[model samples]
Target chain A: PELVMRRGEIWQVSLQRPAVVVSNDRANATATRLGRGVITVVPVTSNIAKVYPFQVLLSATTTGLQVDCKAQAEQIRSIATAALLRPIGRVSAAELAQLDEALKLHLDLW
Target chain B: PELVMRRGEIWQVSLQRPAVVVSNDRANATATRLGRGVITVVPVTSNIAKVYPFQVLLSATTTGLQVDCKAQAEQIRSIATAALLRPIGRVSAAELAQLDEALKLHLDLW
Candidate 1:
């Protein structure tokens, strides 16, 4: 099955936890063409004890999490494209847009 | 040598290019403790032709690059801490703060 990964959703990876697909469509395509089944992703965790500036809070409703979760922008990772098991849920476009801004901050891009 | 990996500078990694350390002090500490010499970083490129929203434009002065560069936030990577070579330069706090914001946007963290 040709798994089409979309942004703003959660997926299971080798990390044995959920992660958000953060790469844009073009980059995803390029990586796929390079004979490497890999995609960039941001790690998510239910632990909210120490939310850092690079993190964004996701509610149970948004992420289908049993409880609130945080998207750790600073904890970004890359995994084999096929490693993404299945889509759990999707976040809103506004949230995704905000994530773009956070990425700039996390990488000191802006 | 206990390499002190600091944020907002360029480092050489197995990728054979330069990447910017994006992780905070706490996470860097945790990663160091896990007996792993890995840290989160964003790739930097001199190419600016296709700067995506998730990427940020960096001036040569800011990054110490001969030409203008872009921080590829979506291409975040976790690399061996020792792979980091020398400190190219440092971005201002204001710039780093903006990167944090871009990270939010790129990762849909917000």
Candidate 2:
């Protein structure tokens, strides 16, 4: 395996807060090996000033982060695999499930 | 449906760089219907001082940025799905295609 990147994985983009892979599985797999494609992702934040409807707090144990971090909905965007700096953690089914709600609201299902 | 914030749409933030929503589709649908949620996002910075390993340098025309900018992978964060602040621009397919690598490198395996 040439470093398989999966959905719900936590990572460092060479910054303070890490990001979570929010894109589906096949796309993630394609990008990991191809090295020249983008994948959607939600950035993680520790600065929980005020919890918003769009933010979800992910448990650290399940996601594999040091502390629970909120997945920012408003800022979700794509990045290339070449830019992924390092592996930090992984996301549990529970966390991704909660995050799914935020993504819907952010994209305007209502 | 509420105001739709797509994955590659760019909008002004409270800070310098406008943000881009990167979350996937299904999650986005769920959140909007709930009327309270967040979306994943990455900050866009015109300050292309040094496009790092995790950063992606985007074109001005395609990205709809006033000027070419780099999506700050390091500063990936979240916010209200409603924070679709005044619309700025949309990420072109070509631009977004390149962005995949940026997110991959930043959010997961490179």
Candidate 3:
């Protein structure tokens, strides 16, 4: 079975509901060629109990998700790209921009 | 000059070298009894170039801060109360909890 994963796209990684691929093109390409099988991702959850500013919010209409979800940047982690079971949807450019900024804030990029 | 600032400790907002106070405490005594100075901030930089994964990297020694100074977060803002500049240190238990989780992900605690 072939899995199509790309940056800004959401996928199911293991038992987790869904996560957004945060790794860049270079890294994603390297993973495919080098057999690294690992990529960085930020988990997404519908639970908005204690939402934080660093987390980007996703809308059902915008993300093709059934419910609005919150991207948990704090829970970011690296998983084998093989764990990316299936692609669910893609994030909008505006939302992706916000995600990028959130990722930067989480990682201290700037 | 009654500038005794607290919460994750670091200060000197105007100077721009340090900034780690993240608002709390009965809304800081009801915004200092209605004067409403405001109080939220997350600006710290040693200027490190590529940091990510929730941005909590700081080394006072041995790391050569020139490459360790990162903006560390998405850029949230708030005003200082009292203009009271005090020693920057010691983030209390509750304060520390919030800061730790916050550095992992910025947010407005409800």
Candidate 4:
């Protein structure tokens, strides 16, 4: 009952500009671990309005999760946030590609 | 006997680089889900006293869990700080390999 896919389900991938960040791992894991979803990778732009390297958006259903990679990883903080939401739907492939594209090749962690 | 290897245990990982972050997830997932643990990779040389880009560590023994994985990836804001700890001798792999070597990793949500 607490899982994204009870059994077999293939998610879609799309292209979106904005991003979402899920805060809870259980839910994020459940949502994303559905093993099929999308990731929207925002670009690393230096626009003075909202300046930074880049951030990723993870969306599960209507819930939108945003993580500022340029600022910090804050995994636990994000995980908790995601966990509190009523997770539904599965993240799309466009979204998953974005996470891959945007991830700053975490040299420190990698 | 909440859990921390109640049966077979073959932990022989060594290395102590500065880290200890554990917040909470059903007692930090009953204290780290009783998995094989050992992770310490920290070094990005910033002499600002407290500055940017450089963090990696995860210790699970003496119960000094602190996750600043570069100010992120808190895994539960350090997993309740201590489901409370008496700081035993298990983290002494330098003292297990030498007694032991300790390191730990976390995030937010009280």
On TM-score, the leading prediction is 1
Model 2, position B36, has a per-residue lDDT of 60
TM-score of each prediction: 0.61, 0.52, 0.50, 0.26
Write the residue-wise lDDT of candidate 1 on B1-110 in tens digits.
Answer: 44566777676676677777787655566555664555788788988999777777777777766788888776778776666666677666766676676665655454
- Candidate 4 - chain A - TM: 0.30
Deviating ranges (above 4 Å) for candidate 4: A5-51, A57-82, A88-91, A101-110, B1-110
Two-way DockQ contest, 1 vs 4, winner:
1
lDDT against the true structure, per candidate, is 0.71, 0.69, 0.60, 0.26
Order of candidates by TM-score, top first? 1, 2, 3, 4
Tens-digit per-residue lDDT, A1-110, candidate 3: 33446778898887367988876655576567766555667789999777676688898997778999999765565577767777889888788788877765553333
Better of 3 and 4 by lDDT: 3
Candidate 4 docking category?
incorrect
Q: What's the distance in Å from true for residue B89, model 3?
A: 19
Model 3 regions lying over 4 Å from their true place? A1-3, B1-110
Error of 3 at A19 (Å): 0.2
Question: Which stretches in model 2 have alpha-carbon errors above 4 Å?
Answer: A14-16, B1-110
Between candidates 1 and 2, the one scoring higher on lDDT is: 1
Candidate 4 local lDDT, A1-110, one digit each (tens): 43442111122212212223322233345455554332211222112344222233433342232332221121212222223223223345564343333232221211
Q: Which regions in candidate 1 have their CA more than 4 angstroms from the true location?
A: A29-36, B1-3, B6-38, B42-75, B79-110
lDDT of 4 by residue, B1-110 (tens): 44342111122212212222221122234345654221211211112344311122223433233322222122212123223232321222231221011111110011
Model 3 chain A TM-score equals 0.88
